[PDB]
Write a protein that binds this DNA or RNA. Structure first.
Lengths: 77, 76, 77, 76
DNA sequence: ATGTGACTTATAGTCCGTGTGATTATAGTCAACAT
DNA sequence: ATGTTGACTATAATCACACGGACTATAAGTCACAT
């Protein structure tokens, strides 16, 4: 569907695994539904900047380093 | 409101201006509503990635250039 | 399958709803997985007395009270 | 160990005796292993409902009578 | 008769994830009128 | 030109649940040898 979305959803998962988190921890720490974290990674889903922020806080990661990894993923072949 | 959401909006407005675009024209170029655009720039909207993407295409700016800028703006 | 199991299964759910609990709450307080609580109610799984005991403690109900409702459900038409 | 588990077992042993059965015979009647039964009666086993059901069949006691008894036993 | 121990094998119970209908909050989109 | 106020309607986001596969702990079932 959307170019950027699958990149965002890819990076959320990448970080989540890097930090040895599971989906449902992240769902807690991000103060969003269990199934939403799944749905974001699983398919992609069209999240909101506010929701993205919540997830970033949950990944225990800064806006900045998130976007830095986002850029790197976009740039790949 | 949100810090990120504010910086996003600021960035959208910044790029629109360094390109000498009007809102009217930013909305024409991305096929969204001008009041919608207005709203974002006065930070009254919490856009989705999809929408953000349409706005980048309307600004004629790559995702990467946008985020490069968004990062810099984020750091005061 | 087993006669007693689906009865035990039924009564666990009945109580759980009577107390306005959700599976999530229950598996919570029973310190079992929410998958297992679902599994039990769903497909009448074959639990252990120890696990049943945990569920009773989770339902905030006593041995006695449970077995009294168990007897009732068995007796029904 | 568990409180319930001990009284299940106690009950199983109680009924086997009130009937005059040996373990050997409770095992035969319920098509289970004798050492299996001995284990339960010394309370070294944590039955599943299914197993309990087989032991009730062997004792020839309905679920209801078993639980009526277990309750009474439970209340000291 | 019953009670051990110790040793496989079935399965109970765990852990992480997928996929889904139904409801609620809210973004997406477009009016009217402002300046 | 841009701002703001309501609106309607799509959909983001929530909530309670089912379902699967893979792995770990342990109950199920059977030996040998006590007594």
């Amino acid at each position: 569907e959307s170019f950027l979305l699958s990149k965002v959803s890819f990076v959320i998962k990448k970080i989540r695994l890097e930090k040895g988190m599971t989906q449902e921890d992240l769902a807690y720490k991000s103060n969003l539904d269990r199934t939403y974290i799944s749905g974001i990674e699983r398919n992609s889903r069209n999240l909101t900047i506010k929701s993205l922020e919540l997830i970033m806080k949950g990944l225990e990661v800064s806006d900045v380093v998130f976007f830095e990894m986002l850029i790197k993923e976009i740039l790949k072949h």
